[PDB]
Subunit: 336 residues, 3 copies
């Protein structure tokens, strides 16, 4: 508890752009420590589709979603947040993992040219959303990309229902984002000089509750082809997914969610053998799967219109040998 | 079972406008009893926002949502429903807690000037939605405010997964309502003389499946500022939330749902350590939380556009001493 | 595992139009077998409402949803899929129950005039969605009716949380479908000659994410009146529900879901005493209920606007004697 006791081991961590996850250990290597992270909020224009649609994003570390921070239950997460003097807005941060002052948002308001340091004890294990929440403009900052997630691993690592340890070989972080880009009378998306010039039009669109794009990792096709996530037959993978503003229903086409903490909380036992899971807006979830077959797999939001029309689909390229017991073409497409 | 056996202890209860809950005991004080409630349906105009938008509501006891009725498993809930002769429509009631005749709706159709008495055994423990369901106009009455909820507490009170008793100090009831108010060619909401004059326009809006307002307790800001819910550090609070027509994803900004019966049923173990929970349209849920930090907390539907743009946000004013172990500002917003 | 070992008992099954389920046994009668099914995809015009709205459906065995296939855990499902030479499009199939090649979709692309045979081991118990998924046109084929579901029963039948066997007397399959029919400037739905002529307009509607109709069994009122599902007081019924593209929240008006596998997976314990359950788009779920009272019951998607305005409501006609202990009208609607 005491302020003198918090002078515990400190550990500076360097973050790695979504979606790889910075280095960490699944089983806590020692006792509680103060884990240090630094993030800069960047207001910048990004292209969200193959047709050149520009968006004035508000991005932690320049990415959409912001990076995944990983700590263990009972460690203290100390974050240094910086708001560049070139930015035009005040920003703060709300960790769903934190207890108090609006997720930390009440203690972190910084205008262009300032920085602040917030520390909180990660008391609850699970994956949680974090995002900017400026008074009067909460929705707008969040739907501009300003959100991400953190993982508070139990000190002894992950397990299933009856305490059986679940260790993953790889971990990926998929941040799903809903964008509301305005259009002109000609149906062509609009461009603006500064973020603020877009506020009014953007809000008229937000109110319809219908996004124009729904993307993984900031852009349509951001995680496909050359940027496809990878694994091999036999590897245990954990996929952390988050949606700060609206619902999503992840589905691994060709596979399943062997263990899924749909609510993202590790003290709540995982659902098993899932085909499609549900993550409500404002939450993060995690699914663990062991690959059985090689090939490409499509990871999508199972509202297939959002997946294939709006932009919410990613690829997994898996290597290994085919298993004919699991599945096999008895008669390939042939004339009748 | 027998009709002669139902002549058990009777208990008349007086209801208290949402969202306080009428007096009751968590642990059933004795044996089964017949609990008596009386409600009047009021057709009246209400203002749902700060810009003066009028709605012809259909409100149980004059409120939106209607009051919370609390009983214990196996008690009989006897309700006297009255439809004032000044009303213009027939109304009935459908308790999701009841078994038979369409939730009781088939046995309770009353035109202006009538009353009826329905009794049912509360066989299943949990929170359940109730609402008017007149044949041919079900959606319309429900989205006009005519819904509320009841709680069927286990005879021995609430508990967590391993039978550990969970006793709350306070209980609040948040009814979330989606309104579909029509607009004229000028984008200005429309006013009508009688509820029926609005039916046609209202339906054209309902079909878009997009509400114009989503409010807690009948109006934008109904539960903020002076009307903020209260608690103190250390108090155990139960928040019952209900949505009779559409989905919501509650989130206590700055806190969590320590135990959440997302499905609202007490025989289904609660999820623990939740950041954001999901309640499907047509259901009620409950979250139990012990306050750890003082300050204001925002209770919202985590689709932040519905929260901050459409009207779905409430406040919690908590008193007590700040805990710097949980969270602390190491460096307040300062120049860089 | 071995190819020689797969020469096990074969069993040809004849499918029965939704929603009756082909004959089967709840407890696996022997050892693993190769269960054989045959389906033909039919491109045909269907009327989805009482106002004569035509849709160019893509239907397995001529129905919307396609039939329910039932097998046991570890059996092999061998499906012969045929694409009539009169059809105009290529079609394939994606079983959420299968592991590999995109649910089998990568191994089953067939143009008009072809057939193929795919086999997969049903390793995971639960209800799963299946649907066509042609590259470049996935959403469009699915929202045209091309989806259905299968059930992989545990070898020893269904049970609740503590292994207590749950045997059903009847089983019904409700497939919920969201349709996006285009309209002309006059608000009147449009008709087309061939499916392809509709593609462009249909997509403009899909992007709004708002269906024009949401129906059970292919049409508004498809399962009402003369086509009402039936049961009697005392019968245990299992209702399998599926939604391949969007969310639904089933509710049995007048009853409950005694045991509900909302996620549709049998190794994930069921939630009990449900009023309204949630099934995410891209998944199938199942609810078990024992009827207690006679009368009509409405089975609906609890977003009452989709239920009563868009078309998502079915009937259950139950016979037996009324139980006055559960519910009783103490004072019928009378003057005040
Ligand atoms: Cu911001
Ligand atoms: Cu939040
Ligand atoms: Cu009414
Ligand atoms: Cu209802
Ligand atoms: Cu097809
Ligand atoms: Cu699928």
């Amino acid at each position: 508890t005491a302020a003198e006791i918090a002078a515990l081991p400190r550990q500076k961590v360097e973050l790695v752009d979504p979606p790889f996850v910075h280095a960490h250990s699944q089983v806590a290597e020692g006792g509680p420590k103060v884990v240090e992270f630094t993030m800069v909020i960047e207001e910048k224009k990004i292209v969200i589709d193959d047709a050149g649609t520009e968006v004035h994003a508000m991005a932690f570390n320049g990415t959409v979603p912001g990076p995944l921070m990983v700590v263990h239950q009972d460690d203290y997460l100390e974050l240094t947040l910086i708001n560049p003097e070139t930015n035009t807005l005040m920003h703060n941060i709300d960790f769903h993992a934190a207890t108090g002052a609006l997720g930390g948002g009440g203690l972190t308001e910084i205008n262009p040219g300032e920085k602040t340091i917030l520390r909180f004890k990660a008391t609850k294990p699970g994956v949680f959303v974090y995002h900017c929440a400026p008074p009067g403009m909460v929705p707008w900052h969040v739907v501009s990309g300003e959100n991400g997630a953190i993982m508070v691993l139990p000190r002894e690592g992950l397990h299933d229902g009856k305490g059986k340890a679940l260790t993953y070989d790889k971990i990926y972080y998929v941040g799903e984002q809903d964008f509301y880009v305005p259009r002109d009378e000609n149906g062509k998306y609009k461009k603006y000089e500064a973020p603020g010039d877009a506020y009014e039009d953007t809000v008229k669109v937000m109110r319809t509750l219908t996004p124009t794009h729904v993307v993984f990792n900031g852009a349509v096709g951001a995680l496909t082809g050359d940027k496809a996530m990878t694994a091999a037959v036999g590897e245990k993978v954990l996929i952390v997914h988050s949606q700060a503003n609206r619902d999503t229903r992840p589905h691994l086409i060709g596979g399943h969610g062997d263990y899924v903490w749909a609510t993202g909380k590790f003290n709540t036992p995982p659902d098993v053998d899932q085909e499609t899971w549900f993550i409500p807006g404002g939450a993060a979830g995690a699914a663990f799967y062991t690959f059985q077959q090689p090939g490409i797999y499509a990871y999508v939001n199972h509202n297939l219109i959002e997946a294939f029309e709006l932009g919410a689909a990613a690829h997994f390229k898996v290597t290994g040998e085919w298993n004919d017991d699991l599945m096999t073409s008895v008669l390939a497409p042939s004339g009748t």
